[PDB]
Amino acid sequence: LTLGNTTSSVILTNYMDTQYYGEIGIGTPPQTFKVVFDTGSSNVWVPSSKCSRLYTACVYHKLFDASDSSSYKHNGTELTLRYSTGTVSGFLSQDIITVGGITVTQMFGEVTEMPALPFMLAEFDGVVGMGFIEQAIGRVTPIFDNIISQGVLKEDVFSFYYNRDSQSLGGQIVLGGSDPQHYEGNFHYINLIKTGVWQIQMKGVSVGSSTLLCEDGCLALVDTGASYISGSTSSIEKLMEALGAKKRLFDYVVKCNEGPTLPDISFHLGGKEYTLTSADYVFQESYSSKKLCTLAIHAMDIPPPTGPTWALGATFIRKFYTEFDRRNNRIGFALAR
Template identity: 55%
Template structure:
């Protein structure tokens, strides 16, 4: 069976190489309501729902069984998902392309009925794939709300038209909170191999090994236009000039094997208020908002006159939005500013305008933290290239 699958993939890959060698491969990204927005629509308070889980996260932040927990907030505000297929014939899944992790997991058809979240999503059924190879090794990712557990399998995964033979996880235990509210099925990690659980080779590394990409890079574009279809695009092999103006500015990753860079300060208006002695900034496609140390974000919110909501998050008076200061991140000798248009989200609730601030407080303890996480609202302003070959990240002003 393994030999049959390898032969099948070789044929497909050879065909792809002959027609698209050194080409850009694209995955359309759809923008959907985040888990937090879904909870609001249901009248459920995220703060109440996650208060105990947040405390549990603080208590459990030491690695367990070689697996460090991923903060729950990573996917609370995620809005962008792309489609991949697994197996033959193809079984389709919406996944978050997450630079903060390096494994691929999707819900399994073998998921227990006790885990309701499995049954609100597409599930992989290995028995229906002629290229499925059983592995069976146990798998676990620790989240603040509990573990995503399951077992490993191997099959053909197609991303952006490129097929690879990939080991991935079938999730058989999926915490209801928060995944029952998620619009995505699973997660495809775009991180480095050294952060992959169980030493599994990541999907993007498999793709690079086929030498079908123009360059060993991928770039992420998120449209700022809510009416734009699709909501964004993941481009493998390079960048698309139609998505930016000017040139890219590059800076090396601060730690080999992680999509993070050294930041030299955060300025609000004309005043540098945070990270004066330098800090770490993680460039995270798995988060829609910007997070920083809770104390720093609290000061920032007071500076712009924001009000904290009982259910979590911050709002400002919509009449004052145009007078809000810019927030500037100092990265690699360049300044990357977000205006009020970039960090204020206009929403309507019960017929009234609500202006939400897209900053969140998140304390990550040493040695990993404290950190700032620059998510989708930063990437929407600055088209971002992730360069694996040169271990660097590039930013250009998005159009």
């Protein structure tokens, strides 16, 4: 490993507190795409010009055209990428990628099959996987590994800041460090259970004062790509019963008026209790006894080897500025500013 003295930041756009995306440029001249920087995955992908316009999602997103890039290198290896909400398929291509002033030769997937659900709901075009090569489909080197190889970065770390929805900054990713302007106090690190996944041990989940869940220990995937905090269908049923929340098809709700009275939810990670108040987990659109308010906590049965696991997504990261440490295989949390 080579360490330089550079840090690079990417400004993120906050869409509705659920999608946080920045810009990247692919090719010569650059074709720009809005992308989600996802710690839960390791592949880079954008929609392809080769995507049939019978996929409505491709009609609604920016497409990569290799015929317009002078730096494009053909590959063609097929690939399928599975996510929680849906799936995408295409083929591999290589070209130059610009990410916050860093220029890297990157192998990425050109998506030719992108389902309307969920991709018609996405404000972003593609994805930039911030995970490890162990999770990469087709064993493609992830973009951070390629940026590490350049020996420009001050430290072998990257940081996430996700702001609350407002003409302010939507969020920020720092490559090579952290930004002290966005956190308070000190970072408290949790070592990874194993290299290859941004997953840590969780010692318990408490609703109110009582350690209601994850009593004998459980897993926590720190996922920048997930909008919500998620647990198993079982865990979430217990949690929701404790909150007085009723299950809908895609979410759990409470009557808007009962939102500010909901108890604090605590997550025991390392040597600290990471607490969320109802203001941190309820989408408080109104205060009406005649309306229903959604929660930023969802059931999600993540399959093995990764799952069963809880996922600490945007709901968590908004409260806690997150540092992902590749040199020491750990994750640091600090109160976000």
